[PDB]
């Protein structure tokens with residue numbers, strides 16, 4: 414059999430939650446296949462169809478600062494680490510669906526929020542009133558799955574195929590941060606009343622939703638230099654959207670105004686306190702082996718406080 418192998422450093426370090434997939438684009442497909450073979454199994458997919466699928470997915474990501482092919486693979490890798498360290502908790506179909514969902518979750522992203530598309534009156538806002546881009550991302554996933562030689566689930570029954578596409582749809586839609594706030598509240602109450610039940614499919618859906626938020630935001634769980642450098646790419650997009658909001662004669666929110674760049678450290682602080690820390694806190698409560706994500710989030714929260722006190726530059 415042909416078994417994907419990684420260099421010695423990558424082989425060890427890919428198992429760590431804070432792994433950076435590196436600047437070599439051409440290695441990312443191999444890194445993804447390796448993660449599928451270990452998290453799912455070498456018999457989960459035909460290698461030729463998976464490779465064809467990977468390259469078609471890559472081609473439908475755009476040359477944008479942040480919401481790009483590197484983000485897709487980075488998000489899948491965070492999902493890999495969660496699956497590997499919680500391997501008894503997930504099903505055959507969930508391992509198949511969830512790495513694919515992560516790879517595909519920002520397909521055809523142009524670097525603009527759902528809000529910009531609504532204000533711009535983009536056709537996608539007419540087609541999908543809520544979770545606009547996320548419904549677009551899923552649609553793009555269905556299109557690619559339906560290309561000749563791209564049915565990577567061809568061995569699944571009709572009913573299993575439908576289940577996995579439903580895992581992928583719900584996982585992709587969960588990456589709408591607007592939905593995260595409600596989902597985390599429900600999970601927090603369920604955990605704290607001791608009512609959360611992983612044998613309940615509506616509960617599994619919420620847990621996978623949280624996992625998808627955690628994976629999508631995972632730049633806050635990297636080592637500080639990766640965290641800081643990724644934040645430049647995030648803001649590069651936010652500021653381009655703010656420019657576009659100004660062009661429509663609309664005041665952009667502060668995070669999207671390139672003139673407000675000196676307030677970034679305080680905005681980061683607000684984001685760690687309102688979104689990130691609660692997210693990885695609730696995830697750790699449910700999946701205790703995800704602890705390193707929360708530990709690394711607290712470490713970066715401390716780093717942003719050092720930037721605010723003038724003991725670090727950005």
Ligand SMILES: CN(C)C(=O)c1cnn(C)c1C(=O)Nc1ccn2cc(-c3ccc(F)cc3)nc2c1
Nearest residue numbers: 590630632633647667668673676677679680681684
């Ligand atoms: C949507 N995405 C991708 C994310 O939210 C996302 C994912 N990963 N990360 C790290 C983010 C992220 O940085 N979010 C935020 C969220 C709120 N903010 C508010 C401010 C702020 C800036 C200047 C100012 F003057 C006032 C406030 N800056 C942010 C940044």
Ligand SMILES: [Mg+2]
Nearest residue numbers: 518519588589
């Ligand atoms: Mg997205």
Ligand SMILES: [Zn+2]
Nearest residue numbers: 518519588629
């Ligand atoms: Zn994303």
